[PDB]
């Protein structure tokens, strides 16, 4: 545990990138989080809203 100040800096930056990547799996109210679902399921005017 002696170098905890330096490990805390490594841990916070890994936690922040892991959070930023997992937010790509969110819908935010769209029909899917997968952008290729929206583009393969819907036509232009309906897709642009999602």
């Amino acid at each position: 545990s002696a170098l905890g100040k330096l490990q805390d800096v490594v841990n916070q930056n890994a936690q922040a990138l892991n959070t930023l990547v997992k937010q790509l799996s969110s819908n935010f109210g769209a029909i899917s989080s997968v952008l290729n679902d929206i583009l393969s399921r819907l036509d232009k005017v309906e897709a642009e809203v999602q």
């Binding site: 393969s40 399921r41 036509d43 309906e46 897709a47």
Partner: protein, 49 residues
């Protein structure tokens, strides 16, 4: 309509353009997919009620 009949559709190739351009239909609507795009998709199953 109180006893609605379900047909499972499987093991086959469709053509939904032949359906949505058919002269037979007085109304046609879709949800979660757009009718123009259906011929590019696949499904684990389809059901007709």
């Amino acid at each position: 309509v109180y006893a609605w009949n379900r047909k499972r559709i499987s093991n086959c190739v469709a053509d939904y353009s032949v359906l949505y351009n058919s002269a037979s239909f007085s109304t046609f609507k879709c949800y979660g997919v757009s009718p123009t795009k259906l011929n590019d998709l696949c499904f684990t199953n389809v059901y007709a009620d």
